[PDB]
Amino acid sequence: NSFEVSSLPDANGKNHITAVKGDAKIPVDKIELYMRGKASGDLDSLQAEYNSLKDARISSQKEFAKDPNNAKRMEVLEKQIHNIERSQDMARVLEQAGIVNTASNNSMIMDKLLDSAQGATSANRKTSVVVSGPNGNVRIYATWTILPDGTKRLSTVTGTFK
Amino acid sequence: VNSTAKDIEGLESYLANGYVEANSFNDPEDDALECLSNLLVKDSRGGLSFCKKILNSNNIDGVFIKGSALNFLLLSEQWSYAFEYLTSNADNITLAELEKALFYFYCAKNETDPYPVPEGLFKKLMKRYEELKNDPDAKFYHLHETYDDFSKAYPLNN
């Protein structure tokens, strides 16, 4: 009972290291992006730009609304911050449980994620697993993309169900 | 950098398949938000059409993007559709949609001539907040803070 680590190309031809088991796949970078608080972007500067837009909209919403480039930027920034906060929260959750950021723990998490994905159809693209640590257990939640060949690629991991 | 046609293709793919590109390793909801908001500033009609399709889809795993779609409509010439959608769906809008709705009206309080609010919508929104406020996912939308801003903006209404 094992998973394999290989390199698979994305739509632009760029290779990504990927853990594979059965009919499921996890780009290994997902561990940093979603579970260990290293989501993309600089939180402090992102929040500063979002705040100035939010404050412009709060004080003058009609005028803010007139140029959709405002809504576009603000919403894009909001999703980046949202992805960072979910990822830092996940890192906090694993740390609280004593599941430190090591290769073996991250392999453990991925193996269990891959196991939970084996059934997944287009009828249900969401799974969850319990991982174990020195300071207790935690449930984590994954969402999956169903590919044209029916295999699954991990989209997201979060500490809470959505 | 995508044409409007390619952004539209990606959005129809997300609605039908759950991905914008089969071999994109990004979260497809992130890809879909890029496509939707890129479309909106280039092709308002098409951008707002796909906002509507996203709100009405029953086949989308993304929650954040339903907020986005609602939000772009609220801030567009088609705000009335978004008011109507909220009135008709308040009972079961998501966390993301509820927070956008509550935030929009908080902001609207500062407008010199805010749009007329449909009968009973604020009561519906508040009720839905009481149903969702204990959802452990709520904090990632700052629902509680947005609720306080809303209620503090409409205190006689509390």
Tab-separated table of C-alpha atoms in Angstrom, chain A residues 8-11 16 18 27 30 34 54 57-59 61-62 64-65 68-69 71-72 74-76 78-79 82-83 85-86 89 92 125-126 144-148 153 155-156 160-162, chain B residues 17-19 21-30 33 37-38 40-41 59 61 63-64 67-68 71-72 75 100 103-104 106-108 110-111 113-115 135-137 139-142:
chain	number	residue	atom	x	y	z
A	8	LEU	CA	2.759	15.531	-14.825
A	9	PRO	CA	2.303	18.453	-17.248
A	10	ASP	CA	-0.384	21.115	-16.918
A	11	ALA	CA	-2.338	22.786	-19.734
A	16	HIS	CA	4.345	19.504	-11.581
A	18	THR	CA	2.312	14.863	-8.257
A	27	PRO	CA	0.048	18.001	-6.901
A	30	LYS	CA	-1.066	21.663	-2.595
A	34	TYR	CA	-3.605	24.765	1.412
A	54	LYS	CA	-13.318	48.418	0.681
A	57	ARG	CA	-16.851	51.392	-1.625
A	58	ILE	CA	-18.247	51.817	1.920
A	59	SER	CA	-18.140	55.579	1.650
A	61	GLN	CA	-20.809	52.673	-3.285
A	62	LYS	CA	-22.700	54.066	-6.287
A	64	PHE	CA	-17.412	52.774	-6.835
A	65	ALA	CA	-19.911	50.574	-8.694
A	68	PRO	CA	-16.437	47.522	-12.774
A	69	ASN	CA	-12.635	47.443	-12.605
A	71	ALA	CA	-15.370	45.400	-8.215
A	72	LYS	CA	-13.022	43.179	-10.237
A	74	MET	CA	-11.536	44.064	-4.889
A	75	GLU	CA	-13.106	40.634	-5.436
A	76	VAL	CA	-9.872	39.109	-6.786
A	78	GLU	CA	-10.668	39.218	-1.465
A	79	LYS	CA	-10.296	35.640	-2.768
A	82	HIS	CA	-9.524	34.319	1.798
A	83	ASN	CA	-7.286	31.542	0.431
A	85	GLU	CA	-6.540	32.801	5.806
A	86	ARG	CA	-7.944	29.332	5.156
A	89	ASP	CA	-5.983	28.309	9.679
A	92	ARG	CA	-2.785	26.329	12.887
A	125	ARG	CA	-16.639	15.648	-5.439
A	126	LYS	CA	-15.998	16.174	-1.694
A	144	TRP	CA	-11.746	17.164	-6.080
A	145	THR	CA	-11.885	17.833	-9.834
A	146	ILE	CA	-13.220	14.949	-11.954
A	147	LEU	CA	-11.166	14.751	-15.133
A	148	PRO	CA	-12.446	13.633	-18.552
A	153	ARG	CA	-7.228	15.833	-8.938
A	155	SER	CA	-8.524	21.113	-5.766
A	156	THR	CA	-8.480	22.314	-2.142
A	160	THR	CA	-13.864	23.391	7.721
A	161	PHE	CA	-16.550	21.932	5.474
A	162	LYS	CA	-17.878	24.126	2.664
B	17	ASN	CA	-17.357	20.066	-15.928
B	18	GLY	CA	-16.242	21.796	-12.726
B	19	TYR	CA	-12.988	23.041	-14.312
B	21	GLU	CA	-9.158	23.777	-18.125
B	22	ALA	CA	-8.861	20.022	-17.597
B	23	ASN	CA	-5.124	20.217	-16.925
B	24	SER	CA	-5.061	23.418	-14.878
B	25	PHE	CA	-3.614	22.497	-11.502
B	26	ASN	CA	-5.156	25.589	-9.892
B	27	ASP	CA	-8.319	25.433	-7.860
B	28	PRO	CA	-10.924	25.676	-10.665
B	29	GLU	CA	-12.983	28.095	-8.591
B	30	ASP	CA	-9.982	30.429	-8.627
B	33	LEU	CA	-13.195	33.881	-10.744
B	37	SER	CA	-14.170	39.080	-13.496
B	38	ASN	CA	-12.008	39.386	-16.617
B	40	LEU	CA	-17.120	41.496	-16.682
B	41	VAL	CA	-14.811	44.425	-17.425
B	59	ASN	CA	-23.933	21.733	-10.311
B	61	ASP	CA	-19.074	23.067	-5.917
B	63	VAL	CA	-19.339	28.727	-2.747
B	64	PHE	CA	-17.172	31.862	-2.876
B	67	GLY	CA	-20.946	35.441	-3.647
B	68	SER	CA	-18.845	36.987	-6.418
B	71	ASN	CA	-21.843	40.874	-5.794
B	72	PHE	CA	-21.167	41.884	-9.409
B	75	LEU	CA	-23.069	46.595	-8.190
B	100	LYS	CA	-22.341	40.018	0.203
B	103	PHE	CA	-22.337	44.117	3.219
B	104	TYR	CA	-24.028	45.685	0.176
B	106	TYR	CA	-24.344	48.345	4.971
B	107	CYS	CA	-22.624	50.307	2.199
B	108	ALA	CA	-25.933	51.412	0.652
B	110	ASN	CA	-24.228	55.963	2.797
B	111	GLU	CA	-25.790	56.501	-0.675
B	113	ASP	CA	-30.558	57.823	-2.971
B	114	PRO	CA	-30.322	54.116	-2.145
B	115	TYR	CA	-32.308	51.675	-4.239
B	135	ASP	CA	-21.476	27.407	10.808
B	136	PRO	CA	-17.753	26.945	11.578
B	137	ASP	CA	-17.005	28.136	8.052
B	139	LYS	CA	-15.560	33.159	10.020
B	140	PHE	CA	-13.782	32.834	6.711
B	141	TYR	CA	-16.350	35.290	5.295
B	142	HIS	CA	-16.236	37.554	8.400
